[PDB]
Design a protein around this ligand. Sequence first.
Ligand code: MG
Ligand code: MG
Ligand code: MG
Ligand code: MG
Ligand code: MG
Ligand code: MG
Ligand code: MG
Ligand code: MG
Ligand code: MG
Ligand code: MG
Ligand code: MG
Ligand code: MG
Ligand code: MG
Ligand code: MG
Length: 154
Amino acid sequence: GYIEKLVQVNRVAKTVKGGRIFAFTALTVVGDGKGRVGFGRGKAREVPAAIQKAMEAARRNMIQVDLNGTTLQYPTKSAHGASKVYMQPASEGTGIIAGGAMRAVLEVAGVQNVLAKCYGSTNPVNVVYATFKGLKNMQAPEAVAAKRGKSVEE
RNA sequence: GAACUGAAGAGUUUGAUCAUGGCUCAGAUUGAACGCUGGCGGCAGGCCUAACACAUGCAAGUCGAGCGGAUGAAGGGAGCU
Ligand SMILES: [Mg+2]
Ligand SMILES: [Mg+2]
Ligand SMILES: [Mg+2]
Ligand SMILES: [Mg+2]
Ligand SMILES: [Mg+2]
Ligand SMILES: [Mg+2]
Ligand SMILES: [Mg+2]
Ligand SMILES: [Mg+2]
Ligand SMILES: [Mg+2]
Ligand SMILES: [Mg+2]
Ligand SMILES: [Mg+2]
Ligand SMILES: [Mg+2]
Ligand SMILES: [Mg+2]
Ligand SMILES: [Mg+2]
């Protein structure tokens, strides 16, 4: 898909005999607004080159999510590193109640009512890791219902 | 047929990084006070401190169909005029 969003641009440095060498890191998310989504990281010596590399990396390794009509299936709670993430479905009139990496990830993924919240560190890359770990494990019915028939598991 | 349906983060320790951890900010509220400024109306509110000391007015009276008593009009008039 093609929906580009830029999350964070940071400037890092390494020390050499002579002084400091600077570089730029960029984090981006891509998706089609209907279930495909992925993130990418890039590094370069200029901001546009890093952004381009991040877009190219993010356009690969895109995954498919299972969403129940512009909203999640069930309340979920994921984590990565020291970051914890909580999301839960909301009514249609609700917006996206989230901040930073949450908002970009969920808006690009195609959901509109997510009402999320994060605990622990708010490092954007770890937050994105945690959010995709949570979203990639959305089961949806007819798959958790592989044990037996349908309309009895619910 | 309703009586509820709802949760955002950021800055700052390093040459740079992740974590831990404190400090600070973005919101809503006052019986508020102070500074600058000030057209109108509706509805409310107005000694949070000294249960400190109080000048002067008013804030608890009524019943003569319970009872003596004294003030006893209007008049009937009479008398002298
Ligand atoms: Mg050497
Ligand atoms: Mg480098
Ligand atoms: Mg954790
Ligand atoms: Mg842990
Ligand atoms: Mg913390
Ligand atoms: Mg902090
Ligand atoms: Mg510095
Ligand atoms: Mg003042
Ligand atoms: Mg004044
Ligand atoms: Mg003034
Ligand atoms: Mg008082
Ligand atoms: Mg006083
Ligand atoms: Mg009186
Ligand atoms: Mg009586």
